[PDB]
Structure 1
Amino acid sequence: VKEQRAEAGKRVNAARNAAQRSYDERLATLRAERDAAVLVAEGIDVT
């Protein structure tokens, strides 16, 4: 879409950075459970 109107009212980057920060947290959160469940999962008889 002037420098006006192309600034405030277009600074939804905070809305995108907040939606990202919610994804980056859950990505690190869900990655931690997978790595934890691997340490407690039933192993195989390697022999």
Structure 2
Amino acid sequence: AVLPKEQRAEAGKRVNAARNAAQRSYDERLATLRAERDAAVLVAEGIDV
């Protein structure tokens, strides 16, 4: 926002590419960790019903 108007297009494009790379890694890691939780829920928290 504080950057000059002439520089916002170039810099903003590099920020979004880095931001999307981090967001991409987070999304799949969240899915991986959720899948592991769902796979381990039956045994780790089982009870005698």
Alignment of 1:5-44 (within 5 A): 5-8=8-11, 11-41=14-44, 43-44=46-47
TM-score by length of 1: 0.70
**Bigger fraction of residues in helix:** 2
- Tell me the percent identity: 100
User: 1:8–1:38: structure 2 CA closer, same or farther, 3 Å change rule?
Assistant: same
How far off its partner does 1:44 sit?
1.0
- Relative contact order, CA 8 A, sep 6+: which one is greater? 2
- The answer for unaligned runs of 5 or more in structure 2 is none
**How many residue pairs align between the two structures?**
45
Q: Deviations over 1:14-38 (max 9, x none)?
A: 1000000000010000000000001
TM-score by length of 2: 0.68
How far off its partner does 1:11 sit?
2.9
**8-17 vs 28-37, which deviates more?**
8-17
- The answer for unaligned runs of 5 or more in structure 1 is none
What is the CA–CA distance in structure 1 between the aligned matches of 2:12 and 2:46, rounded to whole Å?
A: 55
